[PDB]
Amino acid sequence: SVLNDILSRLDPPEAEVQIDRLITGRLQSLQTYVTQQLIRAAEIRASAN
């Protein structure tokens, strides 16, 4: 689960398969969080207004 840990253990050449995925998975976390924030922000905006 750690980028520093995974990188030290693995070389770039075959590194990518695990390095690539963690990145894909983490991107997902951000998008969910980013999307979630917007919905929450919209709710707050209506409340603010």
Partner: protein
């Protein structure tokens, strides 16, 4: 599909190694000669005969 595709900057590599080490001369592989004499790049897009 080689003929249909068109390319620039073609290079030719010449050398003789034993049959056992033929596997070593490939992208992302390890051998005495591969890591000490001639190492193929990770992004190589070439064909070896």
């Amino acid at each position: 599909k080689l003929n249909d595709l068109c390319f620039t900057n073609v290079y030719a590599d010449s050398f003789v190694i034993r049959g056992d080490e033929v596997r070593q001369i490939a992208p992302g592989q390890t051998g005495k000669i591969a890591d000490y004499n001639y190492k193929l790049p990770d992004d190589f897009t070439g064909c070896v005969i």
